[PDB]
Design a protein around this nucleic acid. Structure first.
Ligand SMILES: [Mg+2]
Ligand SMILES: [Mg+2]
Ligand code: NA
Ligand code: NA
Length: 321
DNA sequence: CCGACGTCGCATCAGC
DNA sequence: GCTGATGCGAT
DNA sequence: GTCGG
């Protein structure tokens, strides 16, 4: 329908974020690319697009140009630019954002090769991003995700049978593949102000059984790293895994948010707002007579939240929006 | 015309 | 050495 | 870049 338009907008989005360092323009282009991707008609003019929320004058004009010529002069130019295309490209390495990408490129470090020759200039996260550059862009079929979940539940329950662990993200919604694995962890000993080894013990056991292979970051509540399923057949790609330790009374807010989708949480938070409730990742709080958030409300399941805002409990599988 | 546009854990930097 | 700022990746 | 107070 409109793939050349949404690809153009997304390509424009990356340059804003990665090259121009204009995060708000990057979000503007993505919002336009979104509303256009969900629009069930081949767009015939910019004015037609201008009607969607998030498509403004400049994007209307760009669609017009793309439609008359099949390209954008500005995009063609930026694509052929050595500095800018390299800056944009290097940011595909996890841990290299717009600012590290610019410094590298300033000093002639432009490709994954140049990064290979220059490990001493790279921090821990950046080497791991480089090391698994290829793997980190592969998707994870559900079947692998299920084997990954097997290992995670087994090993956590093994460390202490009173842990509760839930694998969230698109996997929880029954998606056919996933980009990474997001595990939320709680324990009856952990509430609000309340060991700082409850997370460490889990990471430890999963390294012990060679499931977790590398660490990007780890503190007392959040872990970010890499894992790989065990292999005379072909080895599995290395995967991103995050592990979060959330207090008991915030756990179900956490589970809901990190189940997504993006848009579902958008809509739900919005519907929530009009019923005079505000839901963040931690709490659901009732907005008082003048806009004052009061106390976090007691929550013991996902359903509890869904009740408060008089919404119908939704299965994770119907949470695209 | 002009400000908002998400918010925060962790790693690491800049400054004292 | 410590403190607060900044960069990054993110439902 | 778009929106909206
Ligand atoms: Mg026990
Ligand atoms: Mg994730
Ligand atoms: Na519009
Ligand atoms: Na990156």
């Amino acid at each position: 329908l409109n793939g050349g338009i949404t690809d153009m907008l997304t390509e424009l989005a990356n340059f804003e974020k990665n090259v121009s360092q204009a995060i708000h323009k990057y979000n503007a282009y993505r919002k336009a690319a979104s509303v256009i991707a969900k629009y069930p008609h081949k767009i015939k003019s910019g004015a037609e697009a201008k009607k969607l929320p998030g498509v403004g004058t400049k994007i209307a004009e760009k669609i017009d140009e793309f439609l008359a010529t099949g390209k954008l002069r500005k995009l063609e130019k930026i694509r052929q630019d050595d500095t800018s295309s390299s800056i944009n490209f290097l940011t595909r390495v996890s841990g290299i954002g717009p600012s590290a990408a610019r410094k590298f490129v300033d000093e002639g470090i432009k490709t994954l090769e140049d990064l290979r020759k220059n490990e001493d200039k790279l921090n821990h996260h950046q080497r791991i991003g480089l090391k698994y550059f290829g793997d980190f862009e592969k998707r994870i079929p559900r079947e692998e995700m299920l084997q990954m979940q097997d290992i995670v539940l087994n090993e956590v329950k093994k460390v202490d049978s009173e842990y509760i662990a839930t694998v969230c993200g698109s996997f929880r919604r029954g998606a056919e593949s996933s980009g990474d694995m997001d595990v939320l962890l709680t324990h009856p000993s952990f509430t609000s102000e309340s060991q700082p080894k409850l997370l460490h013990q889990v990471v430890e056991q999963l390294q012990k059984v060679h499931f977790i292979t590398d660490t990007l970051s780890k503190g007392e509540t959040k872990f970010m790293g890499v894992c790989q399923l065990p292999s005379d057949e072909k080895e599995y790609p290395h995967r991103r895994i995050d592990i979060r330790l959330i207090p008991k009374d915030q756990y179900y807010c956490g589970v809901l948010y990190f189940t997504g989708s993006d848009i579902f949480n958008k809509n739900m938070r919005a519907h929530a707002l009009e019923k005079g409730f505000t839901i963040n990742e931690y709490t659901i709080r009732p907005l008082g007579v003048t806009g004052v958030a009061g106390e976090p409300l007691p929550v013991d399941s996902e359903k509890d939240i869904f009740d408060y805002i008089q919404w119908k409990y939704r299965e994770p599988k119907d949470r695209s929006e």
